Design a protein around this ligand. Structure first.
Ligand code: RCO
Ligand code: RCO
Ligand code: RCO
Ligand code: RCO
Ligand code: RCO
Ligand code: RCO
Ligand code: CL
Ligand code: CL
Ligand code: ZN
Ligand code: ZN
Lengths: 30, 21, 30, 21, 21, 30, 30, 30, 21, 21, 30, 21
C-alpha cells in the first residue's frame, strides 16, 4: 500500500545506519 | 513484522536494532 | 571509507525498489 | 560482495535482482 | 497523471518505465 | 497536498533508476 | 567510477524541489 | 505520528539545499 | 513550528529559506 | 549536460532552474 | 567533484534520525 | 566541525549525537 510502501523506504535507510557492518534482513511480509 | 510495528508508530533506534543481524 | 559507506546507502534504496515484496538481505562482507 | 561489485562499477537492476531473497 | 496512477496505488518498475524518455 | 508531494519525491528517485541513460521528463499534475 | 551516478540521484532530488509544479527535464547524455 | 515524522525527514533535505553555506537549526517542537 | 507550518500544505523553497541561519 | 555541469562543481539554485519546464 | 556536498546531505539525514525530538544544528562552514 | 570529522572517516551514531541540540 502506498503510505506503507513510502514508510518502508525510510525504514531501510534507518536500518542501514543503525546496523552498520552487521547488515540486516528486510522481509516486509513472510 | 517490521512494517506493522514501525510504520504504525515511530520505532526508536533501539527498536530498530532488533532487526540487525 | 566514507565513499563506499555512501554507495552502500544508495544500494539499499535500489534493492528495496527492485526486490519489492521479496525483501532482501544486506550483508556488507563478501 | 555487493559493494565490491557495485561500488566500483554501476550495477544494472538486472544485476541487483540476484541479491533479492 | 504519473501522480494519479502511482500515489494512489503502488507502481512496479515496469509501469514506471513507461514514463521514461 | 503534502502527501502527494512527498509521493512525487520518491517517484522521481524511482524514475532515476529505471530510466537510466534515457532520462525522463517529470510533469506533476498535467 | 560510480561517482557521477550517485551525484545524479541527488540532482534529480534537487530538481524536484527547485522546479515544483513546473516539473523538469532530465537527460544525462547530451 | 508517523507521517509528521516522514515529512520532517524531507524538510531537512530541503533546508540543506536552500540554506547551502548558511546552515540551519532544525527544531521539531518550538 | 516548521512541521506545523509545512506538513499539510506545501512550503516552497523560498518560504523555507526563512529557517536558514 | 547536467551531470557534467553539476557533478563537477555545485550548481546554485539559479543554474538548477535552467532545467525546469 | 561534489564529494563534501554529497556527504553533507547524508549527514543531515543521519542527524535527523539520531537526534529525534531535540533536532540539531548543521553548520557546513567551519 | 562535522564535515571535517565525518567525511573521510565514518562517524558512528554515537559520534553524530554530539551534534544534537
Ligand atoms: O518507525 C520509523 C519509520 C521510518 C523511519 C524510522 O526511522 C522509524
Ligand atoms: O551500482 C550502483 C550503486 C549504487 C546504487 C545503484 O543503483 C547502483
Ligand atoms: O507507486 C510508487 C510511488 C513512489 C515510488 C515508487 O517507486 C512507486
Ligand atoms: O511542505 C514541505 C514538506 C516536506 C518537504 C518540503 O520540501 C516541503
Ligand atoms: O551540483 C549539485 C549536485 C547535486 C545536488 C545539488 O543540489 C547540486
Ligand atoms: O561519516 C558519515 C558520513 C555521512 C553519513 C553518515 O551517517 C556518517
Ligand atoms: Cl514519505
Ligand atoms: Cl553520495
Ligand atoms: Zn519519504
Ligand atoms: Zn548520496
Amino acid at each position: 500500500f502506498v503510505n506503507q510502501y513510502l514508510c518502508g523506504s525510510h525504514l531501510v535507510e534507518a536500518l542501514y545506519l543503525v546496523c552498520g557492518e552487521r547488515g540486516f534482513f528486510y522481509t516486509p511480509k513472510t | 513484522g517490521i512494517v506493522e510495528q514501525c510504520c504504525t508508530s515511530i520505532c526508536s533506534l533501539y527498536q530498530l536494532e532488533n532487526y540487525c543481524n
